[PDB]
Ligand binder design. Structure first.
Ligand code: PU6
Length: 208
């Protein structure tokens, strides 16, 4: 069964801003997602130092970038801590409420969209390039879930029956028709080198 939820009004407002504002420097979505992956990998690494069994779901700590021109998706995969149902439905939105307010305040005063990551809401920059985002995630203490949203004020959560992932998160970007450059090897390499060159985990860019 699929459950449908409304975003909090402030998140919905953030998403509409991201979708609606004219802003050409869209490529920053990728460093925001890689940065989120890096934080998640830091988290499981740290937690495993006092409970080694937390890596029974997989010892390798890495990031994969997987373009698929047939499906028109760019997927950012990590083996980080993953997210629980409670994260997906309630807790991330709760935390994002204050970040959104600060960000939207910063934007008048002359900040720009590239600075979104300073406010803890960089995930939503995915909507600069994606018409739909699907997030598949597995946390040690919980089941594998699929979260999905095409914005418009709602998202869904379902238990995921797909290929079990062990532990971590896949963000599947269903790209807008005019954003297929982010499926091109040379373009992704350029962006990673420019914005994500010092991430402390291997980033493997898959080819097609
Ligand atoms: C705000 C950072 C924590 C939430 N989070 C995020 C950011 C985020 C925020 C909101 C989200 C979301 C993801 O999926 C659905 O809603 N990415 C990851 C990740 N790769 N691994 C673990 N946790 C993540």
């Amino acid at each position: 069964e699929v459950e449908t939820f409304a975003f909090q009004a402030e998140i919905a407002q953030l998403m509409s801003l991201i979708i609606n504002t004219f802003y050409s420097n869209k490529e920053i979505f990728l460093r925001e997602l890689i940065s989120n992956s890096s934080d998640a990998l830091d988290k499981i690494r740290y937690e495993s130092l006092t409970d080694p069994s937390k890596l029974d779901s997989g010892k390798e700590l890495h990031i994969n970038l997987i373009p698929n021109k047939q499906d028109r998706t760019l997927t950012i995969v990590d083996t980080g801590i993953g997210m629980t149902k409670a994260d997906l439905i309630n807790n991330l939105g709760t935390i994002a409420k204050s970040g959104t307010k600060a960000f939207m305040e910063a934007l008048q005063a002359g900040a720009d969209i590239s600075m979104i990551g300073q406010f803890g809401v960089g995930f939503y920059s995915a909507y600069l390039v994606a018409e739909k985002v699907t997030v598949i995630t597995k946390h040690n203490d919980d089941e594998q879930y699929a979260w999905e949203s095409s914005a418009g004020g709602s998202f869904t959560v379902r238990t995921d029956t797909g290929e079990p992932m062990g532990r971590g998160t896949k963000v599947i970007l269903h790209l807008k028709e005019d954003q297929t450059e982010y499926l091109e090897e040379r373009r992704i390499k350029e962006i990673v080198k420019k914005h994500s060159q010092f991430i402390g985990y291997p980033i493997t860019l898959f080819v097609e």
